[PDB]
Amino acid sequence: SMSVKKPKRDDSKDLALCSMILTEMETHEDAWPFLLPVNLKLVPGYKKVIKKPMDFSTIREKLSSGQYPNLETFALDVRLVFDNCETFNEDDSDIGRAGHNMRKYFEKKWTDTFK
């Protein structure tokens, strides 16, 4: 509270480490559904159903331009990618499986890096 602070957790490496994680995700073989924004002209249903589209390119641009105030807002956008994928795609489709695999991959790198 006022003039009473918890000890300072060192955040100075967070940007670099989120960038490394994101590089790892961009280079995964199963990243292909997630590399660019879903084309809203060519994918019926996507625009109306998925209220907050998110993709790795958009996260990379946000990361590069200071639009994440902290590492939790970065993790929220990554998880949004996989949450959107589960909303729109059957678990037993190639895209649906890709999204599960990517989520698993991310969450391990997240825990190993920060927890």
Side-chain angles (χ1 to χ4, degrees), residues 52-65:
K52 293 171 76 174
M54 188 52 57
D55 71 284
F56 296 168
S57 81
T58 299
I59 299 172
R60 171 65 70 191
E61 185 57 41
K62 286 180 67 165
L63 194 64
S64 288
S65 59

Side-chain angles (χ1 to χ4, degrees), residues 1 9 16 24-25 28 31 52 55 64 70 74 93 97 114:
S1 68
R9 191 223 155 230
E24 292 157 9
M25 281 188 308
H28 192 298
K52 293 171 76 174
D55 71 284
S64 288
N70 55 57
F74 169 81
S93 58
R97 283 189 281 285
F114 294 114

